[PDB]
Design a protein around this ligand. Structure first.
Ligand SMILES: Cc1nc(-c2ccc(C)c3ncccc23)c[nH]1
Lengths: 39, 156
């Protein structure tokens, strides 16, 4: 059996760590729900 | 069981110790996660039981106790926060400007943040604290790094 445990509220937190880039990517979605890079 | 709104860990004892397989969102009495986390299996909350209500392997989404509740959308402009809940570490908000998944069916927001697979299902939020999608289905890029779709369901 899988079980759940609460980990926090869903809140925008002002002054949080800002990171990661913003790539534009060509992708295909298969019937199994797996994304892949179209090139 | 615990029905309180918020983000939750999804755990299994089927491996060594207790292992975090993913995360989800309780809203309006409904549990929302990604399909690859639970494979559609039922869940425990104390001595309470959560039964799947809705799912789709292609969307990679599943809802428990009721229909999909989360209907907010990325506006295509503003930054967002991954409320990341990694295995064995505290909930941590991480702010980012989404990139784009360009598909034959449409454009999707994507977040370029790398976390262990056990983080799948962590919500993505807008400036008003609304869930606009879930993190953990996406792609591995040129670099070897992971980019996730902002995966959102349809509310009926
Ligand atoms: C079998 C499977 N693993 C995933 C997966 C989910 C989330 C993250 C952050 C991942 N990072 C690296 C590799 C896989 C990841 C999807 N499906």
């Amino acid at each position: 059996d899988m079980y759940i445990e609460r980990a926090g509220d869903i809140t925008w937190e002002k002054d949080a760590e800002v990171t990661g880039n913003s790539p534009r990517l060509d992708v295909a979605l298969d019937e199994s729900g797996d994304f892949s890079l179209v090139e | 069981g615990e029905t309180t709104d918020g983000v939750y860990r999804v755990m299994t004892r089927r491996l060594l110790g207790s292992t975090q397989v993913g995360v989800g969102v309780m809203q309006e009495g409904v549990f929302h996660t990604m399909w690859h986390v639970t494979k559609g299996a039922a869940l425990r909350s104390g001595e309470g039981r959560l039964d799947p209500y809705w799912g789709d392997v292609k969307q990679d989404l599943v809802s428990y106790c009721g229909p999909w509740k989360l209907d907010a959308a990325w506006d295509g402009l503003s930054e967002v926060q991954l409320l990341a809940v990694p295995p064995g570490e505290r909930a941590k908000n991480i702010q980012t400007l989404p990139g784009i998944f360009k598909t034959k069916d449409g454009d999707i927001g994507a977040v370029a943040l790398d976390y262990p697979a056990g983080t799948s299902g962590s919500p993505i939020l807008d400036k008003c604290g609304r869930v606009i999608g879930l993190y953990g289905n996406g792609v591995v890029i040129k670099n070897g790094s992971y980019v996730s779709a902002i995966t959102q369901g349809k509310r009926e």
